[PDB]
Amino acid sequence: IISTHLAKLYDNLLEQNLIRVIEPFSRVQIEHISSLIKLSKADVERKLSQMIL
Amino acid sequence: LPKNPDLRIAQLRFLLSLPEHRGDAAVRDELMAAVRDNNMAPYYEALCKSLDWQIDVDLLNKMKKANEDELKRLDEELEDAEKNLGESEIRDAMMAKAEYLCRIGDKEGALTAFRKTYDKTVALGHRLDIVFYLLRIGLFYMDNDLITRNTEKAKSLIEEGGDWDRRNRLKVYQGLYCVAIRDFKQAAELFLDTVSTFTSYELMDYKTFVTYTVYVSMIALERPDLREKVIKGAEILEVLHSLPAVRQYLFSLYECRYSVFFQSLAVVEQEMKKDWLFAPHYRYYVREMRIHAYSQLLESYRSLTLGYMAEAFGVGVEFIDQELSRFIAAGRLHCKIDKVNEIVETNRPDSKNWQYQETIKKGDLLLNRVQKLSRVINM
Amino acid sequence: TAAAAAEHSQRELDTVTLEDIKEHVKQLEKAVSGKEPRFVLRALRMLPSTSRRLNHYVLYKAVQGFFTSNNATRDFLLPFLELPEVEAYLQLLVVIFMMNSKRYKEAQKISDDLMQKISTQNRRALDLVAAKCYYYHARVYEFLDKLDVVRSFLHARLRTATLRHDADGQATLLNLLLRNYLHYSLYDQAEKLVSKSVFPEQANNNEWARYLYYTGRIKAIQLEYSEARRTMTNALRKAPQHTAVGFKQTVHKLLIVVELLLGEIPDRLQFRQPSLKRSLMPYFLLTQAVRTGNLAKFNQVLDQFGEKFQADGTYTLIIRLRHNVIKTGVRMISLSYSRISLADIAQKLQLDSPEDAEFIVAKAIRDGVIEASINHEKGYVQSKEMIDIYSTREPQLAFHQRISFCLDIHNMSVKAMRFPP
Amino acid sequence: DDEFEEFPAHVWEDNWDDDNVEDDFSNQLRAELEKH
């Protein structure tokens, strides 16, 4: 009852951080986004693909 | 409603009439148990003729005599009802007789008896019950003509006055027929409309119905509708807790986990080849789900390297190259391969370009019609 | 008396048919007397129904009772049966009846009488029934299996019907003469005739169907596959819907062949159609074999169904097929690739060497069936850089064609608008 | 209307790709995972 809610919170926080960090851009390197967000390139890329889809 | 005939019978017979599965003897034991229990001498004879089986005369004679005695006593009771009782009980006599013909497996006789009972009876509910028995016979024997005629009859009766319970049972029958004839879109619609109120336990248990709803919904519904009506479906999640493989299939697709998705799709292909209602759809369904997975992966990419696609789908590079080439040639994917440096460019059409092409197509059709009409009338 | 009752009902239907003939003759008389040099097309629309419903006793009684104006030409009909327009229409019905009876000798004699009568009577409103008579003359000589004097006779009639600025007769005669040429495979003659003749821009939609079919056949055998394909697609669109099954089958067969030659894959709806499945099954096998790209299955299909291929006539096309079968392979490859290498093309097409694959693809570029580029420095065939085709003049050109077509339709309709007083 | 008598004469919307003959997808994927 708490793990699911915290997972939802984490996903929403990741989405907000990606939106914030990507706003000042028009063509970014996924490596640079990962560096700015403090996550792994694969995970940030998967989240980006999910958001785009 | 009653199981008449138990469609599990047809399931077993079809599953038996398949290579690499003949004479496993578990299917044969189950089918013989049911046939002996319900004294299906005529269906037993038909099965022997079809599968070239060693006919057991000792038990076949017993089944024949039991069926003959049952038929004679039912007919005698019917004649007694005619001679003494009125229409209200003569109808019940004929109805029970026809039910017994269906139970034994006398197809044509059962249809004739049910036509007579339908002609005699005036009660709307009993008319619906007769039509539903005809629809179940039609599903059992996969006679598309009878199935569609009786579906239209049931719809006409419902319009002429029906009730919610028969409406839902007819919806489940329509969905089953659509699954049979490869109309997965309408099958998805009907199954999802009747998922929360499944009452037709004579066709299949709720778990099998939910598996069918999941499969058909996955192949027919876009991602948003799928999330709203399957991934967020209370009565589907409740059963998918009991069903751990169907859940893995559906959620592997939804959560963009593609290696697990192909694993689940392979197991689904095997299950649904074994199945009797989906049997002439397993190749098409697997192909369409593979195309859906590929389009879903490419929906969020402008240039996807074949190595990444192969790693994501848990396959080789030759496999993905061949599949992508086949589907692009068939026109099912918006992507162009580039093999010298393996990359899959994504040539999706812009909104305005797609609108222009649609305008050209629709205008060509309408202009052909206008030209034909003008040349018909100007002379 | 079951036989007497059946005869009574048949004669009642016969009286109804005589009433219909009377109405058609009244329409013809209204046409000749009043303006609108037309309404003979109304009289003739029911011609297939009249021909189907004609009977020996009906025509015998009709010949006995009619032709009362003058002349004793009734002796050219009565032994065979045991005004300006009415004679022509009734005589057309009579010759059609002899056709239905298969008595080709008297059919041809009376048809030649029709042709002498039309030559004698140079009338314009009659020219439509004249065109139908010419059509049936070609049919009778076809059944007689001569079709030799037919060429010259219909050709002179075409000269007459084009010197007189007719459209219906022009189209009918041109179609009949094209069929005469094809029957003996005089494809060079037909090509010259088509090149030097102008098909009337306002002719019956069925004449358009036939002419488009024949022109497409000429082009296909002449190695203009795109032209033949578009022409026959137009023919199929023009052909009737709930009839003309044989014409539709022939067009479908040769258009399937021509598209396979172009390197495309015909739609499966064709073969699935109820009226065409049985006839097109050999071509269904052919299409399956070519799509699979297997010479062995192609050859076995050809050997199995050569007979139907003699009956239709495609062998030259069915070997140009093999050519465009390798072409189909390369076209699919270029359709589902952007930078594939020559070695990869060769391997996928099962060709012998990248050299051979290079030759095949370069020639495909030449023919414009894949419409790409190539580069043998690194040995890879590049495709044209696809451009956003909406910021260019192609949408303008397409919309211009469609706009001009719609304007022309409106002008034609507002012209055809008539007020009879 | 006119008839061109002068020329002698699965409920499904099936597709060309359905006629292909290849191994079951389960077998294909099994071999793929086996060799990779």
UniProtKB/Swiss-Prot annotation, chain A:
Induction or repression: By FOXO4; expression in embryonic stem cells (ESCs) is mediated by FOXO4.
Cellular location(s): Nucleus; Cytoplasm, Cytosol
Post-translational modification: Phosphorylated by AMPK.
Tissue and organ distribution: Highly expressed in embryonic stem cells (ESCs). Expression decreases as ESCs differentiate.
Similarity comment text for this entry: Belongs to the proteasome subunit S9 family.
Function recorded in the entry: Component of the 26S proteasome, a multiprotein complex involved in the ATP-dependent degradation of ubiquitinated proteins. This complex plays a key role in the maintenance of protein homeostasis by removing misfolded or damaged proteins, which could impair cellular functions, and by removing proteins whose functions are no longer required. Therefore, the proteasome participates in numerous cellular processes, including cell cycle progression, apoptosis, or DNA damage repair. In the complex, PSMD11 is required for proteasome assembly.
Assembly and interaction partners: Component of the 19S proteasome regulatory particle complex. The 26S proteasome consists of a 20S core particle (CP) and two 19S regulatory subunits (RP). The regulatory particle is made of a lid composed of 9 subunits including PSMD11, a base containing 6 ATPases and few additional components.
Protein name as annotated: 26S proteasome non-ATPase regulatory subunit 11
Native organism: Homo sapiens (Human)
Residues included from the entire protein: 318 to 370 of 422
UniProtKB/Swiss-Prot annotation, chain B:
UniProt keyword terms in alphabetical order: Proteasome
Similarity-based family: Belongs to the proteasome subunit S10 family.
Role according to the record: Component of the 26S proteasome, a multiprotein complex involved in the ATP-dependent degradation of ubiquitinated proteins. This complex plays a key role in the maintenance of protein homeostasis by removing misfolded or damaged proteins, which could impair cellular functions, and by removing proteins whose functions are no longer required. Therefore, the proteasome participates in numerous cellular processes, including cell cycle progression, apoptosis, or DNA damage repair.
Keyword Metal-binding: no
GO BP annotations, alphabetical order: proteasome-mediated ubiquitin-dependent protein catabolic process
Source organism of the structure: Homo sapiens (Human)
Pfam families: PCI (PF01399), RPN7 (PF10602), RPN7_PSMD6_C (PF21154)
Keyword Transferase included in the entry's annotation: no
PANTHER family named in the record: 26S PROTEASOME NON-ATPASE REGULATORY SUBUNIT 6 (PTHR14145:SF1), 26S PROTESOME SUBUNIT 6 (PTHR14145)
PCI domain sequence ranges: 183-351
Protein name per UniProt: 26S proteasome non-ATPase regulatory subunit 6
GO cellular component, one term: proteasome complex
Subunit structure: Component of the 19S proteasome regulatory particle complex. The 26S proteasome consists of a 20S core particle (CP) and two 19S regulatory subunits (RP). The regulatory particle is made of a lid composed of 9 subunits including PSMD6, a base containing 6 ATPases and few additional components.
From Swiss-Prot, chain C:
Function description: Component of the 26S proteasome, a multiprotein complex involved in the ATP-dependent degradation of ubiquitinated proteins. This complex plays a key role in the maintenance of protein homeostasis by removing misfolded or damaged proteins, which could impair cellular functions, and by removing proteins whose functions are no longer required. Therefore, the proteasome participates in numerous cellular processes, including cell cycle progression, apoptosis, or DNA damage repair.
Organism this protein belongs to: Homo sapiens (Human)
GO molecular function, one term: enzyme regulator activity
Name the UniProt record assigns to this protein: 26S proteasome non-ATPase regulatory subunit 3
Example GO biological process: proteasome-mediated ubiquitin-dependent protein catabolic process
Residue runs in coiled coils: none
Modified residues (Phosphoserine): S341, S353
Domain of life: Eukaryota
Subunit and partners: Component of the 19S proteasome regulatory particle complex. The 26S proteasome consists of a 20S core particle (CP) and two 19S regulatory subunits (RP). The regulatory particle is made of a lid composed of 9 subunits including PSMD3, a base containing 6 ATPases and few additional components. Interacts with UBQLN1 (via ubiquitin-like domain). Interacts with ERCC6.
Keywords: Isopeptide bond, Phosphoprotein, Proteasome, Ubl conjugation
Record-stated family: Belongs to the proteasome subunit S3 family.
A GO CC term attached to the entry: proteasome complex
Residues shown, of full length: 55 to 498 of 534
All copies of domain PCI, residue ranges: 209-388
Swiss-Prot record, chain D:
Keyword Nucleus tagged: yes
GO biological process, one term: proteasome-mediated ubiquitin-dependent protein catabolic process
GO cellular component: cytosol; integrator complex; nucleoplasm; proteasome complex; proteasome regulatory particle, lid subcomplex; protein-containing complex
Segments passing through the bilayer: none
Subcellular location: Nucleus
Highest taxon, organism lineage: Eukaryota
Keywords, alphabetical: Nucleus, Proteasome
Expressing tissues: Expressed in limb bud, craniofacial primordia and skin.
Assembly notes: Component of the 19S proteasome regulatory particle complex. The 26S proteasome consists of a 20S core particle (CP) and two 19S regulatory subunits (RP). The regulatory particle is made of a lid composed of 9 subunits including SEM1, a base containing 6 ATPases and few additional components. Belongs to the TREX-2 complex (transcription and export complex 2), composed of at least ENY2, GANP, PCID2, SEM1, and either centrin CETN2 or CETN3. Component of the homologous recombination repair (HR) complex composed of ERCC5/XPG, BRCA2, PALB2, DSS1 and RAD51. Interacts with the C-terminal of BRCA2.
Family that this chain belongs to: Belongs to the DSS1/SEM1 family.
Protein name, per record: 26S proteasome complex subunit SEM1
Organism classification: Eukaryota, Metazoa, Chordata, Craniata, Vertebrata
